[PDB]
Amino acid sequence: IFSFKDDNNIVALTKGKLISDVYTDKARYYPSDKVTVKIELNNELQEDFRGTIYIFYKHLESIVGKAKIQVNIKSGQKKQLNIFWEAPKDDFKGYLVEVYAVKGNKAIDNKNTAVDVSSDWSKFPRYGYIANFPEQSKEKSALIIEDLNKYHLNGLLFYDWQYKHNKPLAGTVENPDPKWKDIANRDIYGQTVKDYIELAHSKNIMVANYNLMYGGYFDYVKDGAKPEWGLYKDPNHEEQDNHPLPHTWATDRLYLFNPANKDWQNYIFNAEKDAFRVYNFDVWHVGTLGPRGMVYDYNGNPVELSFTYADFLNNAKNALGKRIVCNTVNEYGLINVASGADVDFLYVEIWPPARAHYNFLKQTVDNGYNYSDGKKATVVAAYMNYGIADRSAEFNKHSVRLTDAAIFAAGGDHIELGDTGMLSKEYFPSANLKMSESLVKAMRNYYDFLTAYENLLRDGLKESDNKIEIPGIEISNNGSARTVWTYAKQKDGYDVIHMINLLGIEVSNWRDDLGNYSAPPIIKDFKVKYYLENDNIKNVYLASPDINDGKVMKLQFKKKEDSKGKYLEISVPELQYWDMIFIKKL
Amino acid sequence: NIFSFKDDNNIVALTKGKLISDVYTDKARYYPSDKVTVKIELNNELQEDFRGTIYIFYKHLESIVGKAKIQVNIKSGQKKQLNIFWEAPKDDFKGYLVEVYAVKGNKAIDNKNTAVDVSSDWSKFPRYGYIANFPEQSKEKSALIIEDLNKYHLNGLLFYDWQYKHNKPLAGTVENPDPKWKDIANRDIYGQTVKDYIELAHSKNIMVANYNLMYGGYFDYVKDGAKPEWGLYKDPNHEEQDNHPLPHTWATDRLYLFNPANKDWQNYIFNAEKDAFRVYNFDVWHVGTLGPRGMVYDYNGNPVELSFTYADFLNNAKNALGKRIVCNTVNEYGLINVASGADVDFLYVEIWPPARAHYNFLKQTVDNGYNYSDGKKATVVAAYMNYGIADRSAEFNKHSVRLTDAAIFAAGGDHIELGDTGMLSKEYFPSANLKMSESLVKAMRNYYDFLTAYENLLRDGLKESDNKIEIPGIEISNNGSARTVWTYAKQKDGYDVIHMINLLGIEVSNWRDDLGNYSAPPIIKDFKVKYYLENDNIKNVYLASPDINDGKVMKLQFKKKEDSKGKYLEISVPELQYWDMIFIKKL
Numbered sequence A: 001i002f003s004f005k006d007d008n009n010i011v012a013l014t015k016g017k018l019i020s021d022v023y024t025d026k027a028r029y030y031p032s033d034k035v036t037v038k039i040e041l042n043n044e045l046q047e048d049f050r051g052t053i054y055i056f057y058k059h060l061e062s063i064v065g066k067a068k069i070q071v072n073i074k075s076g077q078k079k080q081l082n083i084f085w086e087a088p089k090d091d092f093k094g095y096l097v098e099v100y101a102v103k104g105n106k107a108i109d110n111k112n113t114a115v116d117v118s119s120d121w122s123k124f125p126r127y128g129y130i131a132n133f134p135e136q137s138k139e140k141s142a143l144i145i146e147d148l149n150k151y152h153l154n155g156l157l158f159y160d161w162q163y164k165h166n167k168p169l170a171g172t173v174e175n176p177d178p179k180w181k182d183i184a185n186r187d188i189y190g191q192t193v194k195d196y197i198e199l200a201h202s203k204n205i206m207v208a209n210y211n212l213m214y215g216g217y218f219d220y221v222k223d224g225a226k227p228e229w230g231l232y233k234d235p236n237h238e239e240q241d242n243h244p245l246p247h248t249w250a251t252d253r254l255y256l257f258n259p260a261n262k263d264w265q266n267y268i269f270n271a272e273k274d275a276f277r278v279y280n281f282d283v284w285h286v287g288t289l290g291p292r293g294m295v296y297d298y299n300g301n302p303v304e305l306s307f308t309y310a311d312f313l314n315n316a317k318n319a320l321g322k323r324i325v326c327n328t329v330n331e332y333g334l335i336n337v338a339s340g341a342d343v344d345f346l347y348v349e350i351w352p353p354a355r356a357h358y359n360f361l362k363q364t365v366d367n368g369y370n371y372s373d374g375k376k377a378t379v380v381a382a383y384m385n386y387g388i389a390d391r392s393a394e395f396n397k398h399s400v401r402l403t404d405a406a407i408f409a410a411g412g413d414h415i416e417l418g419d420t421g422m423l424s425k426e427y428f429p430s431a432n433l434k435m436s437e438s439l440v441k442a443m444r445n446y447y448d449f450l451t452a453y454e455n456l457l458r459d460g461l462k463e464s465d466n467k468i469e470i471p472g473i474e475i476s477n478n479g480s481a482r483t484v485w486t487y488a489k490q491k492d493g494y495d496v497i498h499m500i501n502l503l504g505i506e507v508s509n510w511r512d513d514l515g516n517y518s519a520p521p522i523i524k525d526f527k528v529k530y531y532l533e534n535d536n537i538k539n540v541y542l543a544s545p546d547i548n549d550g551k552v553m554k555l556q557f558k559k560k561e562d563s564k565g566k567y568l569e570i571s572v573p574e575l576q577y578w579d580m581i582f583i584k585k586l
Numbered sequence B: 001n002i003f004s005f006k007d008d009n010n011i012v013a014l015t016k017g018k019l020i021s022d023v024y025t026d027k028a029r030y031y032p033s034d035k036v037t038v039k040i041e042l043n044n045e046l047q048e049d050f051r052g053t054i055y056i057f058y059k060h061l062e063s064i065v066g067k068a069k070i071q072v073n074i075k076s077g078q079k080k081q082l083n084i085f086w087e088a089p090k091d092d093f094k095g096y097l098v099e100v101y102a103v104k105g106n107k108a109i110d111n112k113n114t115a116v117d118v119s120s121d122w123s124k125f126p127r128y129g130y131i132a133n134f135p136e137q138s139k140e141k142s143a144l145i146i147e148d149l150n151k152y153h154l155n156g157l158l159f160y161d162w163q164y165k166h167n168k169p170l171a172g173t174v175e176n177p178d179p180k181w182k183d184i185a186n187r188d189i190y191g192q193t194v195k196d197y198i199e200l201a202h203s204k205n206i207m208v209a210n211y212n213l214m215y216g217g218y219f220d221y222v223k224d225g226a227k228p229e230w231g232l233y234k235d236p237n238h239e240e241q242d243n244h245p246l247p248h249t250w251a252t253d254r255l256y257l258f259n260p261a262n263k264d265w266q267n268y269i270f271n272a273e274k275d276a277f278r279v280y281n282f283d284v285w286h287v288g289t290l291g292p293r294g295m296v297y298d299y300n301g302n303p304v305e306l307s308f309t310y311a312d313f314l315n316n317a318k319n320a321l322g323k324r325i326v327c328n329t330v331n332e333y334g335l336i337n338v339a340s341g342a343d344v345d346f347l348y349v350e351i352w353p354p355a356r357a358h359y360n361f362l363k364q365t366v367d368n369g370y371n372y373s374d375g376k377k378a379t380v381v382a383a384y385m386n387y388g389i390a391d392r393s394a395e396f397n398k399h400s401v402r403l404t405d406a407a408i409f410a411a412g413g414d415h416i417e418l419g420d421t422g423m424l425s426k427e428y429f430p431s432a433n434l435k436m437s438e439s440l441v442k443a444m445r446n447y448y449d450f451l452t453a454y455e456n457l458l459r460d461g462l463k464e465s466d467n468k469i470e471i472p473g474i475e476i477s478n479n480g481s482a483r484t485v486w487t488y489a490k491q492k493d494g495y496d497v498i499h500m501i502n503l504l505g506i507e508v509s510n511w512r513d514d515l516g517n518y519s520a521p522p523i524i525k526d527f528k529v530k531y532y533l534e535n536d537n538i539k540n541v542y543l544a545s546p547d548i549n550d551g552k553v554m555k556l557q558f559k560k561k562e563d564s565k566g567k568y569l570e571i572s573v574p575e576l577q578y579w580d581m582i583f584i585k586k587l
Ligand SMILES: OC[C@H]1O[C@H](OC[C@H]2O[C@H](OC[C@H]3O[C@H](OC[C@H]4O[C@H](OC[C@H]5O[C@H](OC[C@H]6O[C@@H](O)[C@H](O)[C@@H](O)[C@@H]6O)[C@H](O)[C@@H](O)[C@@H]5O)[C@H](O)[C@@H](O)[C@@H]4O)[C@H](O)[C@@H](O)[C@@H]3O)[C@H](O)[C@@H](O)[C@@H]2O)[C@H](O)[C@@H](O)[C@@H]1O
Pocket: B161, B184, B212, B213, B216, B244, B245, B246, B247, B288, B289, B290, B291, B292, B293, B328, B330, B331, B350, B352, B391, B426, B427, B428, B429, B431
């Protein structure tokens, strides 16, 4: 009766009319932790409810637990219901949690959440951000943290919280200044920073401190940095490299330093040590600005910037006793960081206008996997609808979903959600684009999916060369326009096939610069052919954040053979944006 | 066997180059069953008369597919040329090594090799070069230059800055072409030299490519009938047309850019090109691009993302002209778009430091072109060597130039670097301040023979292999890291192939060597390579290198073994200097 085909499942009639929300107390759980599932009921059935709430805990295709609770709730009344569960003992596992409201012998509402059991964020990063630190009650800060925990975000990057790039702590360790100007002359309140950190930590969220690897203000000599540590655009120390900034900001430019200079390292590590002593950050998120052209140290020797990164980052980790993440802009330095630096995971920011094609969302994640020999996960910053980011306007709910399907299916994570809603540009506080209610609802599904299926998306997978066909439909393996983008991967116990619908896409630009993409065409009851070596295939499944909020469905299939060999012919009921087929092997 | 180098009757070492002065062929590529003419130039510098035998062996990978011999009497200080005729075997898209030996008594005293490519079309195995200067000159002089380039088996040549204007390539009319004109840099171009080169190139089965941008026009383009409505703009109000700035002394101060998706621009530039192709018998339009332009808009203020306009422009150009098309995607800007959607003969990528400085990019550029085309298009790379010293009069670094070619060729690529001025040092092809030393020329002859002769093992039906490689005692990498042997494996029908590229003398993984000061790699002799291979139906193990006996295959000793990581072949390698290709023949 919890099956949606079943005549005793009228959920489509009454969806969201009893179950208002479902979420958990934390972002991440240690094995055997108590998990608290929180259910918010709001009876909008215009009728009193006297029934039962069913909860199923699922690991991929399997039921790993269930619970039921009788609940009455009168028309127009609200209630909360908490369900308590012990996280299973296996580390690094994702689960879907399915909640059903049942009256009589019939399911009348359903909503899902997810649970990530991971002892460390670094295998399955789900990075978000906080860009604003105004004076506000701890109570208001707690509400923002609760909002973000809905998406199971397990890391938060605090963007432009610090005082100076070469002196992040305002005041001193013995007496910290409670208020200061950031880079853009915004007011930052230290107590808001501290509150966010504590609230994050109570939900097992890692908190990351943004600063550049190599930046200092116009007046860096006053604070005790030397021109002799600098990075220069010429071999005669005339023009120190720099990042120009708008004239109302705290300094007219950030001057750049040589990361390989040992005096810069000692100086910046000491300044950060002070910041980490006052503000209980877990991570230093080390920013970079990407390739800088031909550059030189003070004495005119050329500097190969990317060759300096790993040494800097490993020394920084040792100096601070904290975790490190480095942003390799446009993959500049990614090979060097992936193979040599003890970073928690890889982080790649795309700046435009190269890397516009959908395939780069996949390929960036593939490069991170290959250059790390499969040891590091990859986070992508890929700012959606960037061409309209100076408009008072909305994120396009279609292109945002396709971009996330592209990154998530490839085994990546997309840094996009935060206190201001969603990122529209590299300056995180810029918030001219808002998420509509429909997009928010999509993101809840997509982030539940990213969590519950993490074991099939980015755990022990290799690329498969088994051929896929979708008879009658144009396909591509690389995100080409007017195709279903499809490719396969394999791991121990499972083969996974992804289908991403670009049939509505005329031009394969993931960014959707006018914010005007449309709903993909919907294909129902079609066939996929998967050319498989082995015969011991008992079951084939599908899950999609577009279909019943990520609930697994068993698919019909047949074993067949034609001129290209043996294959499974898989019956697929529906594709909207993104479907994940998964085949259970031995 | 007196021809093997380990044999004591082979004393080639002492008298190398003292009798066989050169070996080469009449054409760049051959159709199946064409007559192949191998030309052997003798110059007896032995200081005694020679009365012996010249042996020619025709090799396909490990196997002898033919042989010939001719006894020769040649006196001390005499020169003679032999012409030896062979029939190209019937299988298309095959490369061969041609080994020439001078034997006196039972002793081999000299050796020189060349190669032969049997290909009915250049596009599978492109070997692209250039011609940059078109002064007034005799056909006989043009023929000598084509002969020099043919030594390297170049099967296509890009004519760079031959044309009159980027928006009007033909000077004069079709019926009355101007016999000469000024190019974009105000150099004198002679029409007859362009024509002579085209004709000479065709006689050797060399494709000739006409350079011009996709979307460029001179400062006075309105006079020539082009409209600013077709243009590409840096703002949405059509205030400032996008442009490529040029020196003030040149024919135009700048090249104004147009929107390739504008059908009126297409129609105009296709007609302009149609006239040039009616006069000059070019085979290919090599369509230039400048790479990313930032945010650009059409005349009405609509944003244009350039990379997504390329494929359709190129396909329309091909259909309008009836000619072959190639398009350069600068730093891969547009590469996926062209590779997946354009009917180009092959892919072409300029790659630039600092972003793409790492050795890995030489391989990854080729891998991308291959993956994005679903294995259907070959890739050519432009990577201008020793760029940092290229404004002053000097020599190329012979070590970094070899390592760059090893990396490109091993990956299944080709490198556009050789032409009328010697070798490329800048993106402005005529800039020729760097010269190749004699020793580099000698290496390039070897490397281009190797590129041709081993084309079937380098870029014909190969996939990446995940079979483990170890080199005990030596640091290795799969990605061109500094202070390693760069090694990886590929497999095809009948062969596994293992490349080793020696980056042990490299401090920083940077292929360009901007100061021109890279050193000879260390030489590693008599070492072991472990190659973990499941199947044991192995026929033999071979090695070829352009650094060792001019590309001649050697059979290697190996042993079947097993340790905790699985079964492996322990392969004994006599020597690695720059680049070895091991290949393993399956049963
Ligand atoms: O007189 C003293 C000077 O002489 C010499 O330099 C002359 C000029 O050469 C070039 O311009 C002449 C040619 O212009 C057109 O073709 C331009 C080139 O098109 C391709 O290369 C594109 C691009 O590559 C490099 O930039 C990479 C990348 O960098 C980013 O910063 C940028 O945002 C991206 O858009 C860009 O893709 C390179 O730095 C840049 O110069 C190039 O524009 C193609 O592969 C090249 O072969 C081709 O040259 C025109 O179509 C041609 O007919 C014409 O010959 C050069 O662009 C000018 O900068 C030079 O002034 C000496 O070499 C120089 O030292 C001296 O200053």
